[PDB]
Design a protein around this nucleic acid. Structure first.
Ligand code: SF4
Ligand SMILES: [Mg+2]
Ligand SMILES: [Mg+2]
Ligand SMILES: [Mg+2]
Ligand SMILES: [Mg+2]
Ligand SMILES: [Mg+2]
Ligand SMILES: [Mg+2]
Ligand SMILES: [Mg+2]
Ligand SMILES: [Mg+2]
Ligand SMILES: [Mg+2]
Ligand SMILES: [Mg+2]
Ligand SMILES: [Mg+2]
Ligand SMILES: [Mg+2]
Ligand SMILES: [Mg+2]
Ligand SMILES: [Mg+2]
Ligand SMILES: [Mg+2]
Ligand SMILES: [Mg+2]
Ligand SMILES: [Mg+2]
Ligand SMILES: [Mg+2]
Ligand SMILES: [Mg+2]
Ligand SMILES: [Mg+2]
Ligand SMILES: [Mg+2]
Ligand SMILES: [Mg+2]
Ligand SMILES: [Mg+2]
Ligand SMILES: [Mg+2]
Ligand SMILES: [Mg+2]
Ligand SMILES: [Mg+2]
Ligand SMILES: [Mg+2]
Ligand SMILES: [Mg+2]
Ligand SMILES: [Mg+2]
Ligand SMILES: [Mg+2]
Ligand SMILES: [Mg+2]
Ligand SMILES: [Mg+2]
Ligand SMILES: [Mg+2]
Ligand SMILES: [Mg+2]
Ligand SMILES: [Mg+2]
Ligand SMILES: [Mg+2]
Ligand SMILES: [Mg+2]
Ligand SMILES: [Mg+2]
Ligand SMILES: [Mg+2]
Ligand SMILES: [Mg+2]
Ligand SMILES: [Mg+2]
Ligand SMILES: [Mg+2]
Ligand SMILES: [Mg+2]
Ligand SMILES: [Mg+2]
Ligand SMILES: [Mg+2]
Ligand SMILES: [Mg+2]
Ligand SMILES: [Mg+2]
Ligand SMILES: [Mg+2]
Ligand SMILES: [Mg+2]
Ligand SMILES: [Mg+2]
Ligand SMILES: [Mg+2]
Ligand SMILES: [Mg+2]
Ligand SMILES: [Mg+2]
Ligand SMILES: [Mg+2]
Ligand SMILES: [Mg+2]
Ligand SMILES: [Mg+2]
Ligand SMILES: [Mg+2]
Ligand SMILES: [Mg+2]
Ligand SMILES: [Mg+2]
Ligand SMILES: [Mg+2]
Ligand SMILES: [Mg+2]
Ligand SMILES: [Mg+2]
Ligand SMILES: [Mg+2]
Ligand SMILES: [Mg+2]
Ligand SMILES: [Mg+2]
Ligand SMILES: [Mg+2]
Ligand SMILES: [Mg+2]
Ligand SMILES: [Mg+2]
Ligand SMILES: [Mg+2]
Ligand SMILES: [Mg+2]
Ligand SMILES: [Mg+2]
Lengths: 208, 137, 99, 121, 149, 82
RNA sequence: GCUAGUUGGUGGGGUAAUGGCCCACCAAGGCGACGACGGGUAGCCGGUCUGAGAGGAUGGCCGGCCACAGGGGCACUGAG
RNA sequence: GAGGAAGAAGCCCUUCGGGGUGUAAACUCCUGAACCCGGGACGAAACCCCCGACGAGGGGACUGACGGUACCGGGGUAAUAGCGCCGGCCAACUCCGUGCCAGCAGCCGCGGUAAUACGGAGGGCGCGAGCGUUACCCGGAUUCACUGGGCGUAAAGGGCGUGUAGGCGGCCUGGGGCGUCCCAUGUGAAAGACCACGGCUCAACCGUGGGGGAGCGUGGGAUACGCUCAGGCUAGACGG
RNA sequence: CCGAGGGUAGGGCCCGUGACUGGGGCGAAGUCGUAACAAGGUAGCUGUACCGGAAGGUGCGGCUGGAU
């Protein structure tokens, strides 16, 4: 299904922080703040020159591991974005950002995309009233994302919305902490996402 | 001789590649139409009708760029490339929707259509097609 | 509509029948060059008006026999023995192609 | 060639040749071993490579390589063969599949077990 | 100053009484990703000296590369001693579709979207020279109209 | 004889019928002479029944015999209305 | 190189109907290097896979047409 | 799922100081696939009967294999992971064992006592209910080159003439309009491909609508070019 | 009368196989010589003819992809 093993080793391999854990990522004990070298026996040896294929593969793997999506789904989404009219990198980023689990992670109902996946799957999230239990559901502009009425009195949800009363969501989103409900206004822009990714490298990787 | 049009284009290419001022070609009306198209598009300065040994000839006046600085000071060309498309051994016809775009719009294609000898842009504006004579850029 | 072809009479040795050589042109499907092909048709000629060298028009018709599904519609021109000569020379050249 | 020459004669397509004709269009073939022996490779390699003479269901009789360390094949063993030549052995074009019919899997194999037909320990 | 990309390293040999003696050749491309690109081929008894000399030669031979929206103004086909390069503009999302040598040359020049193909001989040095020539022959519409009218 | 009937399309547990005019000996999902309407028995859509009234009138006028379900659907769409 | 019902004509038989489809007689024609004849292989198409395109390969399922119903031949009934 | 050690034990490596597996585990908190209880489908309104006139148009009833299934509500446990690869191409490296043996191999090639290439182990990379292998097709192969190749020495000019079919052909004027081009119209079924909308909680899948589309028939138009007919010219060719 | 099929006789083409016999490709070693690459120790190559264990030799003519 998905990757369910150790997750800081992914950050150490990619050489950058992929915020895949939530609170611990901003703590001093983040593994990228203590051992910023790749895992294994040879992580502290001098790095050799990366080939072009290595560079493009690492960039694509970074982008894929940020969202925790399998390679089959990732490639299907990429081909779909390439079919659409519009700059394929921006369209691909928008399609990735429209997944329900990512949307409820950004709205603040969860602290990590993994937790957002568990929230959506376990029937705690409703889109436009009806309950949706599929992380891959694609949110269209105007859709209302919210916590189920019987799930509002949940400790995890209560704490998550408490910790977000100060934090402000992106321009492409709206949140009502009192109303416990979100709103997807438009496709996110490429500048609105603080992604350590060059999408041209991903496109060139998939041209091979 | 088998291809007067290709022969004239070859005369122009050969004379241009040595930076001559003018070149002569045996006269004909179709050749005159092609030369008029070339002059209107700025690839040549012009052309005129003269007599050599009592025979009618067309004198074409070639045009070049400014002098260049360096190891090679020969001026750059205004006719970089000229090529015949339809040949006696293979005739090429295109409809109005098969009209090629040469050099993304910097080059031209010459067409023989029922409305006359036109540039590709001219033929597209008139919505007509025909034989493809040559491409120039 | 009934197909009308135009050709030249190259054989009139049968009774009430003329062989008509019809030529057609078409561009080559892949190489683009225009090429010529020819085909012979046996055509019904009940009154035996048309002879060697005649350029005539024939029209698709009800079967008159085997191999005979066209009828001579009208005469186009006469005195075209040169086309017949081309066909006969081409046929004669085959005798030297054997082994 | 000229356009007219191409019209007269055209361009000739390329016909490929099968390297595994004894398979007769199948991915695998069953056979019976008649001779099991060892052969020596060509220069520069030096070894004693284990091969079997196999009479197949398709009517041919071929030589097949036995991969892996140690085998239990002998005369009248039933085997499955697949395509793939052994470079340094003359005339050997097929591989015995380990773990099928009378060809046991490689004992004590720990890596790449889907090849060599060894169950998970 | 410019970004530096090392395209090729190789060791060549000559013979004398005693045996073979080696030399190193470095092909290096220098550019600022804004319209300037240059190529240099340096030979030296040692690799770092070869790279330094290649960069020094590259900085002394640059082309202006008339970019427009990250692509080239028109398609171009250029031959250099049995090597052939074909370049074609593309839409803003295409990316750079090229082999390693043309990709390095075009990326350091500021090209973000292009379609390329290598034909004939695929020798890296001659392919790089052909790419440089093709970039040298690029003309915009203003250039051609300043030339014709 | 010519009949006006229902040809099944869609997928398993999701039937979608086309009201078509065809020869009676053709198999029910085979080629038809022409298509005049469509029907969705589950009514999952605001417009789950459409009929070309003029064409159905023409085909009825020349001797096409509808089936019971087809006749019912044509009556609902108002083909026999006077 | 092939062809002797072979190619054409006249009359007839047969068919829902044209026709050497079949028969009798008369003429000597018909086809072929634009590849006849012979040998090998093959159900054909809408489509499918691949490919930048041009092209190449392919015709499982689904829709259309054809052929066959143990291997051959034949007719009856019938609108078929 | 969240938190969770300058970081336990085991295992591997070490320059003997330590390094890695690794927040990974353990451990605490949270959620609740499987399971349990209850409810419960759509797909089925016609033919049929009554009135009206066995018409049009109104009224009523019967009919479920799938199936107690999908689904809904209320309870509820921390709950399968494997396969290939790690010399270059090609992403991912160390130790031990062996010693041209055993073995690996798609190509180049590895192995003959210090093997990143064989076997095992620790570690790593790629995918993941899959991962590999064999067979076949297209691609890469511009390596049958129409788009888009060549023939002095790399494979490739016939030993040389003459010439049949065929292919190609100078300048000017008019007619035809066969090729060629344009316009309208018929056909190019459905499904599939594309675009938009829509139904299954998404998706696959499906529905609706729209647009394309080579070729072919028909009617009309154009005549620059090719063809064809006719009349001229002398720069090609031939003759004196 | 035609007629599936069966029978008889003579041909054409193709496939498998055969005592024996001819060459070909290959080989981390054998026997005989040393023809070619240097003017390769007789410049080489070449068509043809004859000859010799073998590479090859010689005659006649040709080429330089040899020299002077
Ligand atoms: S704590 Fe740091 S290293 Fe670990 S998953 Fe979060 S961002 Fe990555
Ligand atoms: Mg031609
Ligand atoms: Mg013909
Ligand atoms: Mg014809
Ligand atoms: Mg008759
Ligand atoms: Mg013979
Ligand atoms: Mg030529
Ligand atoms: Mg070896
Ligand atoms: Mg493995
Ligand atoms: Mg070169
Ligand atoms: Mg070249
Ligand atoms: Mg090459
Ligand atoms: Mg008879
Ligand atoms: Mg007959
Ligand atoms: Mg006959
Ligand atoms: Mg088709
Ligand atoms: Mg495509
Ligand atoms: Mg295509
Ligand atoms: Mg079929
Ligand atoms: Mg059939
Ligand atoms: Mg049968
Ligand atoms: Mg049977
Ligand atoms: Mg009946
Ligand atoms: Mg009857
Ligand atoms: Mg955890
Ligand atoms: Mg129901
Ligand atoms: Mg129940
Ligand atoms: Mg529940
Ligand atoms: Mg590597
Ligand atoms: Mg090995
Ligand atoms: Mg292995
Ligand atoms: Mg060792
Ligand atoms: Mg390996
Ligand atoms: Mg190992
Ligand atoms: Mg591809
Ligand atoms: Mg290649
Ligand atoms: Mg190809
Ligand atoms: Mg290619
Ligand atoms: Mg070509
Ligand atoms: Mg070549
Ligand atoms: Mg040569
Ligand atoms: Mg040459
Ligand atoms: Mg040679
Ligand atoms: Mg060659
Ligand atoms: Mg040669
Ligand atoms: Mg010669
Ligand atoms: Mg020769
Ligand atoms: Mg001679
Ligand atoms: Mg001759
Ligand atoms: Mg001649
Ligand atoms: Mg001759
Ligand atoms: Mg001639
Ligand atoms: Mg016309
Ligand atoms: Mg259609
Ligand atoms: Mg929807
Ligand atoms: Mg549709
Ligand atoms: Mg018409
Ligand atoms: Mg002409
Ligand atoms: Mg004349
Ligand atoms: Mg034999
Ligand atoms: Mg000698
Ligand atoms: Mg010697
Ligand atoms: Mg010697
Ligand atoms: Mg010596
Ligand atoms: Mg000697
Ligand atoms: Mg000698
Ligand atoms: Mg000697
Ligand atoms: Mg010598
Ligand atoms: Mg010599
Ligand atoms: Mg001799
Ligand atoms: Mg003699
Ligand atoms: Mg002698």
């Amino acid at each position: 299904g998905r990757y369910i093993g150790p997750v800081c080793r992914l950050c150490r391999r990619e050489g950058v922080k992929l915020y895949l854990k939530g609170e611990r990522c901003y703590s001093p004990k983040c593994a990228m703040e203590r051992r910023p070298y790749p895992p294994g026996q040879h992580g502290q040896k001098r790095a050799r020159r990366p080939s072009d294929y290595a560079v493009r593969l690492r960039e694509k793997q970074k982008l894929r591991r940020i969202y925790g999506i399998s390679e089959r789904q990732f490639r299907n989404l990429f081909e779909e974005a390439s079919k659409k009219k519009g700059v394929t990198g921006s369209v691909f980023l928008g399609l990735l950002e429209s997944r329900l689990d990512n949307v409820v992670y950004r709205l603040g109902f969860a602290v990590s995309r993994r937790q957002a996946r568990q929230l959506v799957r376990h029937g705690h999230i409703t889109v436009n009233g009806r309950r949706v239990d599929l992380p891959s559901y694609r949110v269209r502009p105007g859709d209302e994302i919210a916590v189920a009425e019987k799930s509002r009195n949940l400790e995890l949800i209560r704490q998550n919305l408490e910790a977000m009363k100060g934090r402000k969501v992106g321009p492409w989103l709206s949140l009502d902490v009192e109303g416990m409900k979100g709103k997807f206004l438009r496709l996110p822009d490429r500048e609105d996402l603080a992604l350590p990714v060059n999408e041209q490298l991903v496109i060139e990787f998939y041209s091979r | 001789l088998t291809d007067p049009i290709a022969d004239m284009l070859t005369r122009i290419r050969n004379a241009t590649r040595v930076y001559k001022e003018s070149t002569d070609v045996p006269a004909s009306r179709f050749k005159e139409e092609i030369l008029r198209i070339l002059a209107r598009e700025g690839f040549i300065k012009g052309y005129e009708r003269v007599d050599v040994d009592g025979k009618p000839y067309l004198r074409v006046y070639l045009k070049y760029g400014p002098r260049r600085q360096g190891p090679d000071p020969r001026p750059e060309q205004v006719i970089h490339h000229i090529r015949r498309i339809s040949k006696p051994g293979r005739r090429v016809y295109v409809g109005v929707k098969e009209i090629p775009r040469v050099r993304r719009g910097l080059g031209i294609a010459i067409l023989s259509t029922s409305k006359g000898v036109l540039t590709d842009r001219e033929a597209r504006k008139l919505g007509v097609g025909g034989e493809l004579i040559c491409e120039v850029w | 509509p009934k197909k009308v072809l135009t050709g030249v009479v190259v054989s009139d040795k049968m009774q009430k029948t003329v062989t008509v050589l019809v030529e057609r042109q078409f561009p080559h499907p892949l190489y683009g060059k225009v090429i010529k092909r020819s085909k012979k048709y046996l055509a019904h000629d009940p009154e035996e008006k048309y002879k060697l060298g005649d350029v005539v028009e024939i029209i698709e018709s009800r079967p008159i026999s085997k191999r005979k599904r066209f009828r001579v519609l009208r005469l186009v021109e006469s005195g075209r023995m040169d086309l017949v000569e081309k066909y006969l020379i081409r046929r004669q050249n085959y005798e030297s192609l054997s082994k | 060639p000229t356009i007219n020459q191409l019209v007269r004669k055209g361009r000739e397509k390329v016909r490929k040749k099968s390297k595994v004709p004894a398979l007769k269009g199948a991915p695998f073939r069953r056979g019976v071993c008649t001779v099991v022996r060892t052969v020596t490779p060509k220069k520069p390699n030096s070894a004693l490579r284990k091969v079997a003479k196999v009479r197949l269901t398709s009517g041919y009789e071929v030589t097949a390589y036995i991969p892996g360390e140690g085998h239990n094949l002998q005369e009248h063993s039933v085997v499955l063969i697949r395509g793939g030549r052994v470079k340094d052995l003359p005339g050997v074009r097929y591989h015995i599949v380990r773990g099928v019919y009378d060809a046991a899997g490689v004992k004590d194999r720990k890596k790449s077990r889907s090849k060599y037909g060894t169950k998970k320990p | 100053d410019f970004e530096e990309k090392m395209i090729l390293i190789r060791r060549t040999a000559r013979m004398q009484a005693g045996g073979r003696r080696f030399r190193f050749g470095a092909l290096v491309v220098v550019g600022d990703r804004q319209g300037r690109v240059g190529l240099g081929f340096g030979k030296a008894p040692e690799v770092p000296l070869a790279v330094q000399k290649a960069g020094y030669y590259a900085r002394r031979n640059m082309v202006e590369v008339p970019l427009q929206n990250g692509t080239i103004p028109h398609e171009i086909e250029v031959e250099f001693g049995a090597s052939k390069i074909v370049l074609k503009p593309a839409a803003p999302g295409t990316g750079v579709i090229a082999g390693a040598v043309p990709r390095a040359i075009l990326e350091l020049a500021g090209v973000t979207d292009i379609l390329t193909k290598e034909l004939g001989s695929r020798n890296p040095i001659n392919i790089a020279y052909a790419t440089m020539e093709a970039l040298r022959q690029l003309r915009t519409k203003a250039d051609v109209e300043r030339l014709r009218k | 004889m010519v009949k006006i009937r229902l040809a099944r399309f869609g997928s398993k547990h999701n039937p979608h019928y086309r009201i078509v005019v065809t020869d009676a000996r053709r198999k029910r999902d085979g080629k038809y002479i022409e298509k005049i309407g469509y029907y969705d028995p589950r009514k999952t859509t605001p417009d789950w029944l459409k009929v070309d009234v003029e064409r159905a009138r023409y085909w009825l006028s020349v001797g096409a015999q509808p089936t019971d379900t087809a006749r019912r659907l044509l009556r609902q769409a108002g083909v026999f209305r006077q």
